[PDB]
Symmetry: C2
Subunit: 239 residues, 2 copies
């Protein structure tokens, strides 16, 4: 067992979060599975990634943000995720594991810029609590964010997948699923895309519940709204 | 002792390269030097960074790319840099040291998207050699790029500053200053910006040759062209 002779190309347009933290395993299995498939990848903001699929320069958009604004794409939920706050060992917050949004708003924040990786969930949580957060660094990825938390610039709020006990052993990782709604990373493609079989394999490798029949059903409805509703009774993986 | 009472804010808008690899030292010295200065930072593409300064949302743009296209900013050369190709130990290129541009064009390339971190230097080198490069991953930062070189997707070409023997010990780092022109990281700001003294200190910390008198002279010429010409007889640091 290993190798399929399938011949074609696969153009993935995605973001730093996905590429760094969610895709390497899938991408490695894929390339070893499909020696005759030309894999191309492109990194960008969620909006550029979406534009790229919509303009026809990529097959699939994978991101949390922006994707829903392009109903010329069919969107498929892949997983749910939430944030951690992250601080150096000596920070005041390092002492608890009890994170009120009012406690957090006391601190200067290193997080994502508007339009990136669940930022809208953070604004929502602060706005509905009345609060106005003090964000001193609006970054576009979590490698930058963790760097400047490490320098003592402020309190990090990143995707939980962006921190690992072995990779980032010098950071204290406090869970924040209490104070923020979860975010949903989706995959998008044009309806006019002929879905090769290596594509179905890719989609399902990334999101197990997105089997061919689920995908085809989803593709048939002329509504992203209906597609979201289709998964309402299904669990989703969480990263 | 150590500390200046200066009150004010400093808004820096920059990129992943700078923030990850060129700024942390400077930023740390600065914050400990200026307790009453509010440091703000924003990360983005070179173009968004430049727009940010031009629209007035940041004091300084620091990037290699795009900055020169905004002559409503004064641009100051900070340093020169060049690329390395990077591969896993087992790659064919790992054997030499190494590098004809014709040898490199034989391989699938993991590098920066057009518009990022000296990409235009790479295209230039290939185009003038007649060659057409096979780029399988167009990324926006070197963390992503190094990840997918590590998975064997292809041959990395990054900024030399983005690879370190201790941080990336599992990568073979071949020098490519022979085949590519150098790139120049610049700092930009509006003429209408009152340059506080903490600002001159920052500028000079980042680029020693950009002393106050050099900066003021540069600022007085109405020409970025003339400013570039001003440094024509000076060495520049290399990162």
């Amino acid at each position: 067992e290993h190798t399929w002779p399938d011949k074609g190309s696969l153009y993935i347009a995605t973001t730093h979060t996905q590429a760094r933290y969610a895709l390497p395993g899938v991408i490695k299995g894929f390339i070893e599975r499909y020696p005759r498939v030309s894999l191309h990848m492109h990194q960008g903001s969620p909006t550029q990634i979406a534009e790229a699929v919509s303009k026809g320069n990529a097959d699939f958009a994978i991101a949390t943000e922006a994707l829903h604004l392009y109903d010329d794409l069919v969107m498929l939920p892949c997983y749910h995720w939430n944030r951690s706050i992250v601080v150096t060992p000596d920070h005041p917050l390092a002492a608890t594991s009890s994170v009120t949004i009012e406690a957090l708003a006391q601190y200067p924040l290193v997080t994502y810029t508007f339009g990136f990786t669940g930022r809208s969930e953070l604004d929502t949580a602060f706005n509905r609590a009345g609060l106005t957060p003090r964000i001193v660094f609006t970054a576009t990825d979590a490698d930058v964010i963790k760097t400047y938390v490490r320098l003592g610039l402020g309190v990090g709020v990143i995707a939980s997948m962006a921190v690992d006990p072995l990779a980032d052993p010098d950071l204290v990782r406090i869970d924040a699923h209490d104070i923020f709604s979860h975010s949903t990373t989706k995959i998008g493609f044009r309806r006019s895309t002929f879905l090769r079989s290596y594509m179905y394999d890719f989609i399902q490798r990334f999101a197990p519940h997105l089997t061919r029949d689920v995908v085809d059903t989803a593709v048939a409805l002329r509504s992203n709204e209906e597609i979201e509703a289709m998964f309402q009774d299904i669990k989703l993986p969480e990263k």
